[PDB]
Amino acid sequence: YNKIVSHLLVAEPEKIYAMPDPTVPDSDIKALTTLCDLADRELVVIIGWAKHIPGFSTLSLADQMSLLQSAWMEILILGVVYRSLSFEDELVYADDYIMDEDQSKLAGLLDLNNAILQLVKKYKSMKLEKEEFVTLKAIALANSDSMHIEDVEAVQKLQDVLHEALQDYEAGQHMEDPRRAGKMLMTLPLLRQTSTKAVQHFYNIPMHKLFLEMLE
């Protein structure tokens, strides 16, 4: 077994919940607010998780932040994609918040959710395992291509270590396909692309009580 990959499994964060309020009228506003709150709570956990990635803490705090700033959305997206592998045309943002097509339209996330579903499809066909998922996650962070990195060589070494862990895992656990590690790496471009779409949509995406009182 690969020590780094096994270590990554154990450092995997605990499940987080959306906890949507059932007495609140279902709406785009509710959905988006639920997702935003869920994301922020997942991110606090992600920041702590990173510190357990072998080598991450040896980087400067400036570089640690740069990597996290460049890859935070890719980590969130990869999480949802993974939790959705055993579902059909649905996204498990959380055990207590699974979105189907109709819910996506109502939240104005049809396009974006379908892109995320594109990722789920590829991973389904490859039968992505938990070991591969957590290693790819760490790789996405290490390979986030921030332009503000101070020690390029230290980040490259970080990438090389996680990359070796993945090929080592793939070499022993999947001899039926000697190109499986490469196929995993080839899914990163779509992850980066979908992550970019999500971030772009987040910005693109009031106080009626007080407002009505100001007019009164």
Ligand X SMILES: CC/C(=C(\c1ccc(O)cc1)c1ccc(OCCN(C)C)cc1)c1ccccc1
Ligand Y SMILES: C[C@H](CCC(=O)O)[C@H]1CC[C@H]2[C@@H]3[C@H](O)C[C@@H]4C[C@H](O)CC[C@]4(C)[C@H]3C[C@H](O)[C@]12C
- Residue 207 Cβ vs a copy of itself, minimum distance, rounded to whole Å: 30
Alpha-carbon span 62 to 182, nearest angstrom: 30
Size of the site for ligand Y (CB under 6 A): 7
Supply the DSSP string of 50-86, one letter for each residue. Answer: HTTSTTGGGS-HHHHHHHHHHHHHHHHHHHHHHHTTT
> What are the tokens at 166?
């993945």
Name the nearest CA neighbour of 141 among 48, 56, 14, 45: 56
Contact 32, 107 (CB under 8 A): yes
- Residue 49 Cβ vs ligand X, minimum distance, rounded to whole Å: 13
> What are the tokens at 205?
């995406």
Binding mask 40-59 for a copy of itself (x = CB under 8 A): --------------------
- Residue 122 Cβ vs a copy of itself, minimum distance, rounded to whole Å: 8
Q: In 3-state terms, what secondary structure has residue 3?
A: helix
- Residue 166 Cβ vs ligand X, minimum distance, rounded to whole Å: 22
Segment 60-119, which members bind a copy of itself (CB under 8 A)?
114-115, 118
Alpha-carbon span 74 to 199, nearest angstrom: 10
Contact 97, 34 (CB under 8 A): yes
37 binds, among ligand Y, a copy of itself, ligand X, none (CB under 5 to 8 A by kind): none
Size of the site for ligand X (CB under 6 A): 18
Contact 128, 85 (CB under 8 A): yes
Phi and psi dihedrals of 47, rounded to 5? -60, -40
Q: Which stretch binds ligand X (CB under 6 A): 74-82, 125-133, 149-157, 187-195?
A: 74-82
Alpha-carbon span 100 to 156, nearest angstrom: 39
205 binds, among a copy of itself, ligand X, ligand Y, none (CB under 5 to 8 A by kind): ligand X
- Is 44 a binding residue for ligand Y by CB under 6 A? The answer is yes
- Is 72 a binding residue for ligand Y by CB under 6 A? The answer is yes
Segment 121-150, which members bind a copy of itself (CB under 8 A)?
125, 139, 143, 145, 147
**Interface ranges with a copy of itself (CB under 8 A):** 114-115, 118, 125, 139, 143, 145, 147, 156, 159-160, 163-164, 167, 178-179, 181-183, 185-186, 188-193, 196
**Interface ranges with ligand Y (CB under 6 A):** 40, 43-44, 47, 68-69, 72
